[PDB]
Structures are given as C-alpha cells and as structure tokens.
C-alpha cells in the first residue's frame, strides 16, 4: 500500500565524479519561474545562491529586480514596496498557508526548497511525479479537482498536470517538451536543496583517494611490526638455528 517506487533515472550528477549539469539547471529555473512558481514557493532559496553558480551576477540582478517585495518600515512607520535584490528569497505566490489552500481547493502546495530530497526516491520522485499523470484506473472515479498520478500517495493529487509541450520557450533553444521540462526542473530543485553539492563531491574525491594511499601505508607498517610476532619459534625439547 506504499506509493509506487520511482524508477532510477540516469541523471548526470549521480556518478561519484560528476557535477550538477549547469545548462540543465539553468533550464530548470526557467520552468520553475514560469510554471511552478505560480502555486509553489521556495522560501529557503535566495537569488545570491545562483550568482556565479547558475547565472552571472548581472543576470541574477535582473531576475530579482523583476519581482516586488514588501519592505519597511520607513521613517513614517509605513511599509513600502521595492524591487528585489540579491539578498531576497524567491517570491511567494501567497501570503500564508490559509491563502494558498483557499486558492487551491483546500490543498496546500508544499514549499519546494527541499522537496527534491523529501520523498522516497529523491530526485527520481520529482521526475516520475511530473510524468506520472495517466488516465484513472478502471473502477476509480476522482472528485473534480483530483487527478490520477501513479506516484502520489493514494493516487489522487490536487495539482493539475503542470507541464504541457510548448508551455515555455527555452532561451538556449532546447526543444520544450513535457519530459524535457520535468528533467530540467528536477535537476534545478536538486541543486536548490544542496547548492554545495559540487563542493562536497570534489572535496570528497580528494579525501577518498588520499584515504586509499593512507590505508596502504598503515598496512605496510602493520605487516612490518607483526612479522616479529608471527614468525617466532618457541621450542621446548628442540633447538634449531
């Protein structure tokens, strides 16, 4: 009765010495901004996280400046509105959970900051869920506002199928198809969860390889000293030199 387990998608970053594919991360953010951001929020993702990692600094400033953020108080104690900056988090579509539920028929779109690692299957769950929308199984009728997804627990999700071919135009010119968009957004959300992923693996590579050399040295030392012990000869009524 547990939800169907996602298949193992062959993402580039799964191998030991592989990084996050930045071009895919760039395309993933476009999908999130233009599709996912209407209902979902990324509270813990800030624009500065993308500077010199996904986009150059000037480009990230333009993205942040597109949005408006309520800031204050001013000298008169009023709250004003300003364009965004690198220090701001990603904008939230709704002011609070109650507002989000009301606009989504009582279903709360979860924050996507850590959703890439918050489900069994991890990144595979996101890719599978987005492409897991099929017609309902015979004998299963869904109340309006519920759709059949093989991977959502229970089979009925309040999220409309979000990806449609031609929904957005990729800047780099990659053909925009549902599967491509699911792959990219899954990549981007994986990066957002742990932006230090590449730093961790590169340093891990140096440590792991060095630890192997360290194992050889202690092994030679261990063999050397224990030769004194394992080759001794204790005699009682005999003597050999």
């Amino acid at each position: 009765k547990d939800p169907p387990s996602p298949p193992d998608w062959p993402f580039w970053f799964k191998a030991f010495s592989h990084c996050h594919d930045i071009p895919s991360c760039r395309r993933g953010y476009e999908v999130y901004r233009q599709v996912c951001a209407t209902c979902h929020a990324a509270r813990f993702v800030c624009f500065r996280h993308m500077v010199n990692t996904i986009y150059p600094e000037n480009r990230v400033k333009q993205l942040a400046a597109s949005f408006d953020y309520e800031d204050g108080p001013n000298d008169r104690g009023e709250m004003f509105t300003r364009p965004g900056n690198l220090l701001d988090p990603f904008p939230s579509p709704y002011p609070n959970e109650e507002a989000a539920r009301f606009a989504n028929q009582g279903a709360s779109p979860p924050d996507l900051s850590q959703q890439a690692a918050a489900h069994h299957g991890g990144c595979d769950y996101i890719m599978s869920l987005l492409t897991g929308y099929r017609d309902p199984p015979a004998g299963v009728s869904l109340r309006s506002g519920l759709y059949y997804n093989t991977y959502f627990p229970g089979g009925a999700i309040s999220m409309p199928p979000p990806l449609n071919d031609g929904a957005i135009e990729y800047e780099d010119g990659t053909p925009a198809v549902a599967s491509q968009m699911a792959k990219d957004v899954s990549q981007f959300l994986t990066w957002a969860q742990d932006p230090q992923h590449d730093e961790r693996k590169l340093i891990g590579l140096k440590m792991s390889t060095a630890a192997l050399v360290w194992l050889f040295s202690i092994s030679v030392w261990n063999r050397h000293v224990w030769t004194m012990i394992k080759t001794r000869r204790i005699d009682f009524t005999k003597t050999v030199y």
Partner: peptide, 27 residues
C-alpha cells in the same frame, strides 16, 4: 598538488557541463 591533480580530473570528466564551460547568453 594532490588537490591540483584531482581538480583537473574533475574538470576533464565534467567537460561542457560546468558553469565556467558554458558562458551564459543574455536574452
């Protein structure tokens, strides 16, 4: 130099997929 060697190994394996390898074209 151990760090230097494996940094080059990383750059070669991930050729074409790093941020530095793909300069961004402004719309």
């Amino acid at each position: 130099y151990w760090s230097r060697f494996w940094e080059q190994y990383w750059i070669r394996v991930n050729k074409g997929r790093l941020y530095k390898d793909v300069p961004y074209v402004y719309p």
